[PDB]
Design an enzyme around this catalytic site. Structure first.
Site, PDB file in Angstrom:
ATOM      1  N   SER A 136       3.769   3.910   1.577  1.00  0.00           N
ATOM      2  CA  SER A 136       4.287   5.287   1.416  1.00  0.00           C
ATOM      3  C   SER A 136       4.896   6.033   2.617  1.00  0.00           C
ATOM      4  O   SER A 136       6.085   5.881   2.940  1.00  0.00           O
ATOM      5  CB  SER A 136       3.185   6.165   0.821  1.00  0.00           C
ATOM      6  OG  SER A 136       2.273   6.610   1.815  1.00  0.00           O
ATOM      7  N   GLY A 137       4.082   6.869   3.253  1.00  0.00           N
ATOM      8  CA  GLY A 137       4.548   7.645   4.388  1.00  0.00           C
ATOM      9  C   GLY A 137       4.522   6.922   5.718  1.00  0.00           C
ATOM     10  O   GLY A 137       4.096   7.487   6.724  1.00  0.00           O
ATOM     11  N   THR A 150      11.219   2.393   4.780  1.00  0.00           N
ATOM     12  CA  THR A 150      12.605   2.321   4.345  1.00  0.00           C
ATOM     13  C   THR A 150      13.575   2.827   5.422  1.00  0.00           C
ATOM     14  O   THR A 150      14.640   2.237   5.623  1.00  0.00           O
ATOM     15  CB  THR A 150      12.806   3.080   2.995  1.00  0.00           C
ATOM     16  OG1 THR A 150      12.209   4.379   3.069  1.00  0.00           O
ATOM     17  CG2 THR A 150      12.148   2.321   1.844  1.00  0.00           C
ATOM     18  N   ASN A 171      -1.352   4.398  -4.415  1.00  0.00           N
ATOM     19  CA  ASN A 171       0.025   4.579  -3.938  1.00  0.00           C
ATOM     20  C   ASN A 171       0.942   5.097  -5.054  1.00  0.00           C
ATOM     21  O   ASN A 171       1.086   4.455  -6.103  1.00  0.00           O
ATOM     22  CB  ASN A 171       0.563   3.247  -3.384  1.00  0.00           C
ATOM     23  CG  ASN A 171       1.885   3.403  -2.632  1.00  0.00           C
ATOM     24  OD1 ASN A 171       2.427   2.433  -2.104  1.00  0.00           O
ATOM     25  ND2 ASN A 171       2.403   4.627  -2.578  1.00  0.00           N
ATOM     26  N   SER A 226       4.760   2.250  -5.444  1.00  0.00           N
ATOM     27  CA  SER A 226       4.557   0.914  -4.895  1.00  0.00           C
ATOM     28  C   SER A 226       5.487  -0.139  -5.487  1.00  0.00           C
ATOM     29  O   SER A 226       5.482  -0.377  -6.696  1.00  0.00           O
ATOM     30  CB  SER A 226       3.102   0.472  -5.095  1.00  0.00           C
ATOM     31  OG  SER A 226       2.923  -0.889  -4.757  1.00  0.00           O
ATOM     32  N   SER A 227       6.296  -0.767  -4.639  1.00  0.00           N
ATOM     33  CA  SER A 227       7.186  -1.807  -5.123  1.00  0.00           C
ATOM     34  C   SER A 227       6.323  -2.960  -5.596  1.00  0.00           C
ATOM     35  O   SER A 227       5.604  -3.564  -4.809  1.00  0.00           O
ATOM     36  CB  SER A 227       8.111  -2.279  -4.008  1.00  0.00           C
ATOM     37  OG  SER A 227       9.246  -1.456  -3.888  1.00  0.00           O
ATOM     38  N   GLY A 252       1.772  -4.786   0.468  1.00  0.00           N
ATOM     39  CA  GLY A 252       0.784  -5.131   1.465  1.00  0.00           C
ATOM     40  C   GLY A 252      -0.580  -5.422   0.864  1.00  0.00           C
ATOM     41  O   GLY A 252      -0.817  -5.234  -0.344  1.00  0.00           O
ATOM     42  N   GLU A 254      -4.076  -5.195  -0.575  1.00  0.00           N
ATOM     43  CA  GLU A 254      -4.734  -4.123  -1.345  1.00  0.00           C
ATOM     44  C   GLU A 254      -6.241  -4.320  -1.441  1.00  0.00           C
ATOM     45  O   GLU A 254      -6.724  -5.438  -1.593  1.00  0.00           O
ATOM     46  CB  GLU A 254      -4.203  -4.031  -2.798  1.00  0.00           C
ATOM     47  CG  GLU A 254      -2.686  -3.973  -2.965  1.00  0.00           C
ATOM     48  CD  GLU A 254      -2.242  -3.600  -4.390  1.00  0.00           C
ATOM     49  OE1 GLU A 254      -2.880  -4.036  -5.373  1.00  0.00           O
ATOM     50  OE2 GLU A 254      -1.234  -2.874  -4.538  1.00  0.00           O
TER      51      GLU A 254
END
Ligand SMILES: [Ca+2]
Lengths: 156, 145, 808
Positions: free
Chosen positions: C178-179, C183, C228, C231-232, C452, C454
Site C-alpha cells: 500500500s503506502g 508504484t 490491504n 492488493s494485486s 509480498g 502474508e
C-alpha cells in the site's frame, strides 16, 4: 632492580631541595611527591601519583628520603609513560585536514577539557615557554608543541 | 673560615693600629680606655678587662684576628647578601613584603625561631608593613643608620 | 557521503560534513550504552546499571526508566562512528535493534534511502522531496554505488551498466505494500532508463504509456484483502527492452499467478476483484443492464461472500477511471462490452441452482442458464445438456452423465474461474499490443511486482500459495547473494566455507512441492469422493508431523480464534495455517464438452476458449515454475519500499510495522546471512588511519604499509584469529570486532591525552625547579647572616671596629 648509588645521590639532591622549602627536617610533604618525581625527570599522571602516595592537601602525610626511594622505583616500573609516537597518533585524531596543524583553540580545549584537565594558566605558560606561535589561521603545528614540550625548559 | 679575607684583615689592621701605640703593637688596657675618649662614650674598668679574657693574653694583631674567629664564620661577602635578598623582591626596591619574609624565615629553609623572629622585628627597617632589605644589609656590616 | 557534502542537491541524501562530524561525536560508552526492547517504539537505547544472574538492570535514555531486562535481551548498540550509516552491512552490531535504529535515525533526519547489502531500502517520505532532479541524475549517471550516497538511481543505473557491460538481461524485484509508494518507484525507475537511453551522445512517454494500463490491470487483478485495501493478486513483470547501443527499444508486460480462487470465494473481510464492485455501481447503468444485473453487488454468491465495499475507496469513480483507461489503451467499446459481459456472465453462473434425483442433478430456474447461455452466445439447451449430462467416447460415444449435484456446482465455479483467467490473459495481450513499438529488442531490464509475504490471524490455502511463492523468491535472492560473496571472498583470497544460502529455504519449499508434500497430499486427497478436512489433515500428520522440522503443529486458540492445523517455518517466520476447505478450494476440473461447445458464436468467446480435470495448486506450481525459470535468467537487483506508518505522515516511524516488513522483505534474512560470515571489510589504509593509535611505533606514518600495520595492531590486541581474515586489500571482520576496536581507541586516546598533560606538568615544574634552587642559596645566605648578626650586634668588639674605622 634496586637503585644505584648515583641514582640515590640524585633523588637525595631533589629531595633535600624539597624538604628545604617546606622546612629542612628530613621530611617532604606527600602533596609534593609528584612535583618531586617530576624533578627527577619523570612525567607521572595524577592517577599514578595517587596510587603511589600523593595526597591532595599539605599537612596530611610526610616522607623521609628512604620512603620516597621505593616510590620512585615502583613508579618507574611503568613503561607506557608515553612516546612521541603515541602523542602523534593522538593529535591526528583532531587533525581535520591532515597537515599537522590544529586550531590552538582546540588543542587548548583538549588540554583543559579532556584527560586530567589542565589550568587556563598552565596552558598559557607552556605555550609561551615552548615559544609556539599561531598564524593568521595557519594555526599551531602540534608536532612543534610536542617536541618542545618533550625537550624540556632547559634545551641545551 | 679563613674567609677572614684580606679586605677584612687589612681593614682590621687599621683598626688595631689607631688604638695601639702600646709598647710596639698591643691593644692594652690604656690603649682601650684612651680610645673611648675620641670615641665619645663611657669606659668601664672590669669590662675593659673582661674584653681581654677573650684571647689567651696580650693582644698583638695576630691574636686580634684570631679573636675575630666568630666574625668570619658566617659573613658572606658584601654584595652576595644584597643579591640574596633580591631574589625575593619582584617589585624592584622598596623591597620585600613583610608577610612573605616572615613565612620565608619562620617556616621555610632553616626555620627561624619565634624568638629569633622578634630579635629581627625589633630593629627591622619597615613601612607599609613591607620590608627594606638594602637597609638591612647595611645594618649587618653597618655604616650606621 | 559523497562528492560535496555541502552541494545543495545532497540535502536529502548526504548530511553535511559538519552535521555528520557532529552526529558522529555524540557521547558514548560501549561498556554501558545499549539497545533494549520497548513495548512502544520497538527498541530503545539505554544504559546498564547493575547485573545479577540472568537478570540485568538498566536505565533508558529518551525517557529515563529503570527496567529489568534479561541478559539475552540487552542489545549492543553501534558506536558513534556508525551513526547515520549508509549501508547497514557496515554496521558492527547487526541486530534487529541496530537495523531499526540505522533506518529510523536516517528517516528522522530526512533521509529515505539506505543500503543493506544488496538491498536498497527506500522508506516513504510522504511529501515531495528534491531527490529526483535531472541534475542529480547526472550526479549518478555512470557511477558505481559506493561513489555516491544511497539512491534508487544508483541501483537503476548500475543495472543499466551491467546490462551494457555483461550483455545479459536484468531484473529489478521491488517489494512493498500500500503506502510504500511501490508504484512511484517503478515509475521513476522507468523514467530513468529513459533519460539515460537517449542520454549517451546525440504520443506519450514510456512511464506513461505503461502507467496508462494500471487502471485496467488493477480492476481485474487487485482486490481488498483482510490487511490491504488494494492488493494485486497476480504478479507482473514490466520488461523494458533495449537495442545493442543501450537505446530504449520497447516494452511489454507478462503476468503470472493470477489468484483465480477469488473469482468464486471471499473470506470474511475481503472481496472479489475490484471490477465486480465497479460494474455494479451507478456510473454506467446501461452496462448494468446489458449484463442482465441489478446494481446490488450483495445479490450474487460469487461476489457477496465477503465485504461489499472498502473504506477510502470510491467504486463509481474507479469504474470511471477504469473505463476511461480502457479507451486510452484504445480498444473498441464493443470489445469493452464483451469484457464487461463476460464479467457479468460470471455473476449469474453463481446464481444457477441445481437439484438431483438419486445421483443425477438437474436444472432449477433455467433463467440463469439462458442468461449465461446468451451472454456467451451459445444455446442454453445444449449448455445445460453438456453440464448436466455430457457425452464422451471410446470407439463410440457414451453419456458421461455421471454428473450429480456436487459435481455440477463445482463444474460451474470452474467455468467462472476459467473465463476470468482467459479474460485476464487476453486483457494483457492488449496492453502489450498498445506497447509494441517497431524497434528491435536485444536486452531488457524487467521490474517485478508481486504479492509480498502474508501472515494474517487466519491463513488458508491462499496464504500458503503466496508464501510458497515468496519463499522461492527469497531463495532466489539467497542464491544471488551466495554467488557474489563467493566471488568477493575469492577476490581477496579468503577461504570460502559455505553451502549455497539458497538451500536454507529448500526444506520448506520441498515440504510444499515434493511428492507426498502438502500440495500433492492435497491433490491426491482431492480424488476421493468422501474425502474431508479431517482425512486430509490426518494424512498430513501421518506423513510429516514429528517427521520433519519445518512442519509443526499449533494449538486451539480463543474459542472463535480459528483452529489452525499446522504451521511451517518460513524465512519470514513461522506461519500457522487452517485446513478447512482446501479440498473444495482446490478442485478446478476442466470439462471438455463445455469448451468445445464454448468454441462457438460471440467473437471474444471463440478466441478465448479457442487458444484429467485438474487443480489450482497444480496450476500455481506451473506458473511459479515459469516465473522462476525467468528470474534465474537475469541478473537481479532488489529494491525494498517501506511503509513507515499506518497514518500516512512524514518523518514518523512505526517500529513494529517496519520490522514486520523487514522480515517479509528478506532484509532481515540477508542480514541473518551476513552474520554468518565476515560482514565488516576495511581497506588497509582506512584501518591504519583509524587504529594506529592502538599500536603506535616510531616509523613515520607515511612510510608504514597499511596491511603491515593492521596485522600488528590486531595481533598486539591478541584478537582471536577466528574474528578476522586478512585479504589482499581489506581485512574481514566478524560481528562486533569493530565494536571492540572503537572502544579501545577511545580508551587509549583518553589515556594518551592525560600522559601529554603529564609531560607539560613535568616541564612546568622542572623549570620552576631551577628557580627553586637559586632561591634556596638565597634564603640560605639570608638566614645565617641575619643569625650571625643577632650575635655580633652585642659583642662589644663588633661595635668598636664599627666606630673605630668610620674614623680612619
Ligand atoms: Ca622539610
Amino acid at each position: 632492580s634496586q637503585l644505584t648509588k648515583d641514582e640515590i645521590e640524585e633523588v637525595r639532591e631533589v629531595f633535600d631541595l624539597f624538604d628545604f622549602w617546606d622546612g629542612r627536617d628530613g621530611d617532604v610533604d606527600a602533596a609534593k611527591v609528584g612535583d618531586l618525581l617530576r624533578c627527577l625527570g619523570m612525567n607521572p599522571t595524577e592517577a599514578q601519583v595517587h596510587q603511589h602516595g600523593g595526597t591532595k592537601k599539605m599537612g596530611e602525610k610526610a616522607y623521609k628520603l628512604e620512603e620516597i626511594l621505593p616510590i620512585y622505583e615502583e613508579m618507574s616500573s611503568k613503561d607506557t609513560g608515553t612516546a612521541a609516537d603515541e602523542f602523534m597518533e593522538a593529535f591526528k585524531t583532531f587533525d581535520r585536514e591532515g597537515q599537522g596543524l590544529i586550531s590552538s583553540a582546540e588543542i587548548r580545549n583538549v588540554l583543559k577539557m579532556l584527560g586530567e584537565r589542565i589550568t587556563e594558566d598552565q596552558c598559557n605558560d607552556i605555550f609561551t615557554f615552548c615559544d609556539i606561535r599561531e598564524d593568521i589561521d595557519g594555526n599551531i603545528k602540534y608536532e612543534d608543541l610536542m617536541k618542545k614540550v618533550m625537550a624540556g625548559p632547559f634545551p641545551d | 673560615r679563613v674567609k677572614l679575607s684580606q679586605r677584612q684583615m687589612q681593614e682590621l689592621k687599621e683598626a688595631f693600629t689607631m688604638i695601639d701605640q702600646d709598647r710596639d703593637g698591643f691593644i692594652g688596657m690604656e690603649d682601650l680606655k684612651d680610645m673611648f675618649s675620641s670615641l665619645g662614650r663611657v669606659p668601664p674598668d672590669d669590662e675593659l678587662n673582661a674584653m681581654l679574657k677573650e684571647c689567651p693574653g696580650q693582644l698583638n694583631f695576630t691574636a686580634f684576628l684570631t679573636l675575630f674567629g666568630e666574625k668570619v664564620s658566617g659573613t658572606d661577602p658584601e654584595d652576595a647578601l644584597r643579591n640574596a635578598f633580591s631574589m625575593f623582591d619582584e617589585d624592584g626596591q622598596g623591597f620585600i613584603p613583610e608577610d612573605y619574609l616572615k613565612d620565608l624565615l619562620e617556616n621555610m629553609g632553616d626555620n627561624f625561631s619565634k624568638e629569633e623572629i622578634k630579635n629581627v622585628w625589633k630593629d627591622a627597617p619597615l613601612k607599609n608593613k613591607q620590608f627594606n632589605y638594602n637597609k638591612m644589609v647595611d645594618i649587618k656590616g653597618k655604616a650606621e643608620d | 557521503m559523497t562528492m560535496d557534502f555541502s552541494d545543495p542537491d545532497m540535502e536529502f541524501l548526504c548530511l553535511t560534513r559538519q552535521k555528520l562530524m557532529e552526529a558522529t561525536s555524540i557521547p558514548f560508552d560501549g561498556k554501558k550504552n545499549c539497545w533494549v526492547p520497548d513495548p512502544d517504539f520497538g527498541f530503545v537505547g539505554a544504559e546498564i546499571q547493575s547485573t545479577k544472574g540472568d537478570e540485568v538492570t538498566v536505565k533508558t535514555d529518551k525517557t529515563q526508566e529503570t527496567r529489568v531486562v534479561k541478559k539475552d535481551d540487552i542489545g549492543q548498540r553501534n558506536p558513534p562512528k556508525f551513526e547515520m550509516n549508509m549501508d547497514m552491512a557496515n554496521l558492527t552490531f547487526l541486530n534487529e535493534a541496530s537495523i531499526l535504529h540505522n533506518l529510523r535515525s536516517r528517516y528522522e533526519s530526512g533521509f529515505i534511502y539506505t543500503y543493506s547489502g544488496l538491498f536498497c531500502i527506500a522508506i516513504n517520505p510522504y511529501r515531495r522531496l528534491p531527490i529526483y532532479t535531472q541534475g542529480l541524475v547526472d550526479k549518478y549517471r555512470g557511477k558505481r554505488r559506493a561513489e555516491m550516497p544511497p539512491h534508487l538511481f544508483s541501483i537503476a543505473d548500475n543495472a543499466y551498466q551491467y546490462m551494457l557491460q555483461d550483455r545479459e538481461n536484468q531484473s529489478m524485484l521491488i517489494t512493498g505494500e500500500s503506502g510504500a509508494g511501490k508504484t512511484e518507484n517503478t515509475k521513476k525507475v522507468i523514467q530513468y532508463f529513459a533519460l539515460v537511453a537517449a542520454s549517451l551522445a546525440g504520443k506519450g512517454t514510456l512511464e506513461d504509456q505503461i502507467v496508462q494500463c494500471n487502471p485496467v490491470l488493477e480492476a481485474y487483478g487487485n482486490a481488498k484483502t483482510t490487511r490491504n485495501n488494494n492488493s494485486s493478486r497476480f504478479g507482473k513483470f514490466i520488461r523494458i527492452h533495449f537495442g545493442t547501443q543501450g537505446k530504449i527499444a520497447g516494452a511489454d508486460i507478462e503476468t503470472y499467478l493470477l489468484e483465480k480462487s477469488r473469482v468464486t470465494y471471499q473470506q470474511s473481510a475481503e472481496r472479489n476483484y475490484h471490477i465486480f464492485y465497479q460494474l455494479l455501481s451507478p456510473a454506467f447503468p446501461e452496462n448494468i443492464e446489458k449484463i442482465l444485473a441489478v446494481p446490488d453487488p450483495g445479490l450474487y454468491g460469487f461476489i457477496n461472500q465477503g465485504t461489499l465495499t472498502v473504506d477510502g475507496i470510491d467504486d463509481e469513480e474507479e469504474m470511471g477511471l477504469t473505463d476511461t483507461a480502457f479507451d486510452v489503451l484504445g480498444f473498441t467499446d464493443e470489445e469493452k462490452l464483451s469484457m464487461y459481459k463476460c464479467t457479468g456472465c460470471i455473476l449469474h453462473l453463481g446464481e444457477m441452482k441445481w437439484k438431483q434425483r438419486g445421483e443425477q442433478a438437474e436444472a432449477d430456474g433455467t433463467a440463469e442458464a439462458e442468461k449465461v447461455a446468451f451472454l456467451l452466445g451459445v444455446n442454453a439447451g445444449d449448455l445445460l445438456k453438456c453440464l448436466l449430462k455430457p457425452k464422451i467416447k471410446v470407439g463410440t460415444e457414451y453419456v458421461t452423465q455421471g454428473r450429480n449435484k456436487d459435481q455440477v456446482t463445482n463444474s460451474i465455479a470452474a467455468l467462472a474461474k476459467s473465463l476470468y483467467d482467459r479474460m485476464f490473459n487476453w486483457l494483457v495481450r492488449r496492453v502489450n499490443q498498445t506497447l509494441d513499438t517497431k524497434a528491435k529488442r536485444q536486452f531488457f531490464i524487467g521490474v517485478l511486482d508481486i504479492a509480498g509475504f502474508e501472515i494474517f490471524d487466519f491463513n488458508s490455502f491462499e496464504q500458503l500459495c503466496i508464501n510458497y511463492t515468496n519463499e522461492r523468491l527469497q531463495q532466489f535472492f539467497n542464491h544471488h547473494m551466495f554467488v557474489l560473496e563467493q566471488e568477493e571472498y575469492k577476490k581477496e583470497g579468503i577461504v570460502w566455507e559455505f553451502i549455497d544460502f539458497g538451500l536454507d529455504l529448500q526444506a520448506c519449499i520441498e515440504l510444499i512441492e515434493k511428492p507426498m508434500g502438502i500440495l500433492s497430499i492435497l491433490e491426491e486427497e482431492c480424488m476421493f469422493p468422501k474425502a474431508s478436512d479431517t482425512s486430509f489433515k490426518n494424512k498430513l500428520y501421518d506423513n510429516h508431523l514429528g517427521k520433519n522440522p519445518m512442519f509443526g503443529k499449533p494449538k486451539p486458540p480463543k474459542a472463535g480464534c480459528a483452529e489452525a492445523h499446522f504451521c511451517l517455518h518460513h524465512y519470514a517466520g513461522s506461519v500457522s495455517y487452517s485446513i478447512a476447505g482446501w479440498l473444495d478450494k482446490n478442485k478446478d476440473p476442466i470439462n471438455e464438452n463445455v469448451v468445445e461447445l464454448l468454441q462457438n458464436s460471440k467473437e471474444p468467446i471463440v478466441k478465448m476458449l479457442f487458444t484429467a480435470f485438474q487443480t489450482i495448486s497444480s496450476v500455481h506450481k506451473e506458473s511459479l515454475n515459469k516465473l522462476m525459470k525467468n528470474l534465474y535468467s537475469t541478473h537481479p537487483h532488489f529494491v525494498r519500499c517501506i511503509i513507515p506508518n499506518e497514518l500516512k505522515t512524514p518523518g514518523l516511524i512505526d517500529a513494529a510495522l517496519v520490522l514486520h516488513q523487514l522480515r517479509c522483505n528478506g532484509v532481515l534474512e540477508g542480514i541473518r546471512i551476513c552474520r554468518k560470515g565476515f560482514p565488516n571489510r576495511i581497506i588497509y589504509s582506512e584501518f591504519k588511519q583509524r587504529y594506529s593509535i592502538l599500536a603506535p611505533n616510531a616509523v613515520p606514518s607515511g612510510f608504514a604499509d597499511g596491511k603491515v600495520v593492521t596485522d600488528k595492531a590486531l595481533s598486539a590486541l591478541q584478537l582471536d584469529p577466528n574474528e578476522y581474515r586478512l585479504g589482499n586489500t581489506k581485512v574481514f571482520f566478524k560481528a562486533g570486532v569493530l565494536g571492540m576496536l572503537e572502544d579501545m581507541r577511545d580508551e587509549r586516546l583518553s589515556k594518551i591525552i592525560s600522559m601529554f598533560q603529564a609531560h607539560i606538568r613535568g616541564y612546568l615544574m622542572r623549570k620552576a625547579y631551577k628557580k627553586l634552587q637559586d632561591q634556596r642559596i638565597g634564603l640560605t645566605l639570608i638566614q645565617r647572616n641575619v643569625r650571625k648578626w643577632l650575635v655580633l650586634r652585642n659583642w662589644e668588639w663588633w661595635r668598636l671596629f664599627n666606630k673605630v674605622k668610620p674614623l680612619l
